[PDB]
Every structure is written in structure tokens, then in C-alpha cells.
Amino acid sequence: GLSDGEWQLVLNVWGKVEADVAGHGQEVLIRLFKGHPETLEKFDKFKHLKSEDEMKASEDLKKHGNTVLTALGGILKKKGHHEAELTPLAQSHATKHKIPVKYLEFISEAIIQVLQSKHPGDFGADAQGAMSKALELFRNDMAAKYKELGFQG
Template sequence: MLSKKEKALIKGIWEKLTPVAEYIGSQALNRMFVSYPGTKTYFSHLDISPGSAHLFTHGKKIVLAIAEGAKDISQLMVTLAPLQTIHAYQLRIDPTNFKLLSHCLLVTLAVYMGEDFTPVAHAAMDKYLSAFAAVLAEKYR
């Protein structure tokens, strides 16, 4: 799936983005809510207006989970096991939303990183986020 070079590239990108996790995560979530309004239903208990503390807090959690998974992509199933259970059995998130958020993250990364988000980085990140979404949706099967 991902080459050693791609894994290293992904790991490096997320290491650089960890300090701005709140920003990246909130921007991606906001983009998802605007582009796919139906996704808001899972956040009715939070203030998800642009710039809200809840949006920054949840966005940071998402980005940090993605960054944690990028540290050792070969162990993604192990790393995400607790999140699989929470999302499938407690939150009951429609797994399609993981793909929608992945797309919004790609756009957010392209905007934030600019020229550093090369076609190679884009392709590698798309593969990684697709794998991440697939692993999160694993408990639904």
C-alpha cells in the first residue's frame, strides 16, 4: 500500500503539523460542516461555529490521532482500536463521514502547506487518510 518513502513523508508532515493541530483540525471540520451539512448531526451537543473552543478542541483530537497513527502506519489497527470501538458502538458515526473528513483534511493541508504539499505528498497523504478511514470503519463490518 504505502512505500517506505511515503510512510516517512507522511510521518514528517504530521510531525510538522502537530504544533498547529487545533488550527488544522478546526479548519477541516469547519470545511466538512459547510460542504456536508449532514455531518453536523453528530456534533449537536457542541458549539461547532467557526472559531469555537469546541471546534478547536475536537479538531485537535482528530489531528493528534492521525499524527499518532502516522508514527507507525504498520500498526494502525492497534493504534486505532480504541477509536474504532468508540466511533462504532458509542458514537455510531456513519463511516462515510470518515471519508468526507479525509477529503476535507486534504484540502485543508493543501491550503495550509501551499507548495510544500507536492503531488507526491498529496498522493501519499490520500493513501494514508484512506487507510485511516478504513481502519476506523472496520468495526462496522
């Protein structure tokens, strides 16, 4: 449900993430886990991190943040015509990783916070509104797929 100009604002600030995907991805998962501690409990591999300093040092957390934002970028570049990219993620998150839809709101919040924290000058009011709409469209489509698969949306 985005306009073409709102997709361009999203893809233009996504270019800042592409200049450093793993660094943004690491900061998103740290913000997700420090903001909403219960999300960390879905990651069996990341329990042992008892602090933001242990999370910062974890090369596996950084590698997983990289994988997370590389997939999200694949989804955003499709501008809404993203069913083929979205399906595999809704499949794996609804079944194997046991992620509720609400946790998707939390990581959406962490992404905006990261973008605002790292690019305050480039991520103004128009870019913010457009990225919020993009992440809402992703969340909504993820939830519709979960319902299709027999899960709570």
C-alpha cells in the first residue's frame, strides 16, 4: 500500500544499510534484545550473552544480524510484490522458530531506532513515515501468511 515515492524513500535510506549491512544487523538485534528481553529467549544460540558487551563481541550475533537484514533488504527491494521472498520467511518463523506476530512489531521498532540512531540527518520525517509503512506492510503480509498456514496472525 505504498506510493511509488514512498518506495523510493524506503529504498534510498535502505542504501545506507547496504553500505554496512552487518553493522546495522548487529545493532538491530542488540536493540531488540535490550528493549524486549523475552525475544532473546527464542534464540537458543544467544542465551549465554548476559550483557550488551557480550552481545557486541559475539561474531555469531553479528553474522545473524547480517542474515536478517540481507533477507529484509531482499523483501524491501521487491516493493510489495514480495510474495516469493516473504513465503519462506513466514514458513520458517511460523513453524521452526516459533515467533509470534507481536515480536515482528518489536524488531520493526528496533530497525527504525537503528536507522534513526545512525542516520538522523537522512532519516527525516518523510523517510521515517515511508519505512514505517513498508515495515507495517511486511508485518501485515507476514501475519496473513501465518493465518494461511493455520497459525495465529
